[PDB]
Amino acid sequence: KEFEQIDKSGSWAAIYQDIRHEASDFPCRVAKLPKNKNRNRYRDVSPFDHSRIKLHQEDNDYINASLIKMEEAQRSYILTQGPLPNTCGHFWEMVWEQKSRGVVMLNRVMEKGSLKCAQYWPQKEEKEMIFEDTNLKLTLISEDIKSYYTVRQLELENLTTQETREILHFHYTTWPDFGVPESPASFLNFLFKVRESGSLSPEHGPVVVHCSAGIGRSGTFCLADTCLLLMDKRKDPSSVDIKKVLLEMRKFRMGLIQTADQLRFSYLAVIEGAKFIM
């Protein structure tokens, strides 16, 4: 209903306007520190100090990442920017330390003729990556390339202790160049694929999600997921408010969903995913 009304009245941009206005604003002192300038992909996308993920290194614990703890749904996520040439080792340190199982990439390394992220994982299993700085090794065990996404089974080994962990890499490869996806079918089907793996389950650390800044599409993933999970617990889609859930997540990281266009899509995905869920 609400979705249909906003569409009829065309008030999407307005709706999004007010959400941006209602959004929480918190400090990002650490991020802004000069010694961290090169640890950030974008000027306008920073992790709030209260929720940033700290690296377990006595050196510099900065990594542009935020933990989003959704108490009600009982689900956490770690939103992050695509790792930079100089931060792929930090990215993996974080993954290891936070005991993450899955990694969700919602972007292509190159979109619109520009490199939106680093090739932080191996492409050929016969050539593994070793992150000197964080003393971690990464190996491609397998990958399944499909029409709209690719799953990769990587193995992350802590070179310090020789411990080995199986990380799953869910790569959404079909998000449009401009605009949002014409239909939620693939996104939801991708979400579901992420869910099935146990990557989102409580028995693991929070899933690391990222696009370029890790807020637009990453935000969409998390919003669709949480709302759907909430509609399950209460089993009442009538109480699950997309806008209220979004604002709740925005207390943890800025810019989740960056265009009213995307907002409408989150409504589409949630509404469409509720069909199976309900």
Side-chain angles (χ1 to χ4, degrees):
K1 296 190 189 71
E2 180 190 331
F3 173 82
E4 300 190 307
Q5 177 211 82
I6 310 168
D7 235 11
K8 194 174 196 62
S9 52
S11 47
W12 284 108
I15 305 297
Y16 187 57
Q17 288 164 355
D18 197 41
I19 289 189
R20 277 200 177 296
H21 194 256
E22 292 182 50
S24 329
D25 189 27
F26 295 111
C28 294
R29 276 71 98 97
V30 179
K32 302 306 176 307
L33 265 40
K35 69 177 176 186
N36 290 324
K37 203 283 157 283
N38 70 292
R39 289 190 173 203
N40 286 312
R41 181 166 301 278
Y42 299 122
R43 166 196 51 66
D44 55 288
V45 192
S46 297
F48 294 142
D49 295 315
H50 92 76
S51 52
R52 71 188 186 99
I53 259 81
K54 306 210 305 179
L55 295 178
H56 300 169
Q57 66 175 50
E58 303 172 61
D59 175 63
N60 178 347
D61 67 20
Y62 187 78
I63 178 160
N64 180 332
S66 299
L67 168 65
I68 300 177
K69 262 186 60 54
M70 299 303 288
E71 222 60 87
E72 228 273 79
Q74 271 297 120
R75 193 157 279 180
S76 281
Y77 314 87
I78 290 184
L79 293 221
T80 191
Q81 67 184 195
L84 293 154
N86 69 291
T87 74
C88 302
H90 297 154
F91 177 91
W92 288 112
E93 188 192 326
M94 163 169 84
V95 166
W96 181 271
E97 297 169 353
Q98 305 308 306
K99 302 183 191 305
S100 297
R101 170 162 185 63
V103 171
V104 182
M105 182 158 184
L106 304 170
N107 74 127
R108 280 152 55 235
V109 170
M110 176 174 275
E111 290 175 298
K112 277 149 65 176
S114 303
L115 302 172
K116 307 305 183 185
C117 159
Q119 186 62 230
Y120 63 93
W121 72 96
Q123 300 166 287
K124 296 272 168 289
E125 42 263 89
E126 336 86 25
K127 42 185 66 68
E128 15 57 52
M129 295 177 74
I130 287 179
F131 308 94
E132 273 76 38
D133 60 316
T134 44
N135 197 52
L136 286 164
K137 192 205 298 179
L138 183 61
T139 302
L140 187 73
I141 298 301
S142 63
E143 72 168 339
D144 179 39
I145 305 177
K146 322 192 80 58
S147 30
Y148 63 103
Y149 82 95
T150 295
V151 192
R152 295 180 189 94
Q153 180 186 6
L154 306 161
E155 182 191 289
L156 180 64
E157 173 197 340
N158 180 335
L159 284 176
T160 297
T161 60
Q162 288 174 78
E163 302 171 71
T164 269
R165 191 177 301 177
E166 184 216 78
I167 307 298
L168 298 182
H169 193 248
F170 296 91
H171 188 174
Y172 196 64
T173 47
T174 48
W175 225 93
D177 225 13
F178 299 90
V180 89
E182 33 63 85
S183 68
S186 310
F187 194 76
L188 291 173
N189 217 93
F190 168 71
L191 201 216
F192 299 158
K193 261 51 169 292
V194 182
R195 277 184 176 181
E196 293 182 346
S197 63
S199 297
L200 283 177
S201 304
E203 59 243 41
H204 298 106
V207 72
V208 166
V209 181
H210 84 71
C211 26
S212 201
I215 66 181
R217 308 199 274 237
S218 313
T220 297
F221 193 71
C222 300
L223 185 55
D225 187 39
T226 297
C227 292
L228 291 177
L229 193 65
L230 283 185
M231 300 191 151
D232 256 349
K233 277 178 172 59
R234 314 169 174 187
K235 218 69 188 183
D236 188 24
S238 329
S239 43
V240 174
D241 177 2
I242 291 288
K243 306 183 302 299
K244 79 175 181 180
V245 186
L246 175 56
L247 279 163
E248 182 53 40
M249 296 195 182
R250 279 189 179 218
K251 303 180 174 181
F252 305 93
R253 187 180 176 89
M254 61 174 55
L256 309 189
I257 276 61
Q258 293 298 232
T259 70
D261 197 19
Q262 260 160 16
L263 181 61
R264 184 188 181 265
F265 177 81
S266 306
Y267 273 63
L268 275 190
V270 173
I271 294 168
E272 227 291 290
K275 306 307 184 180
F276 169 59
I277 275 59
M278 325 295 257

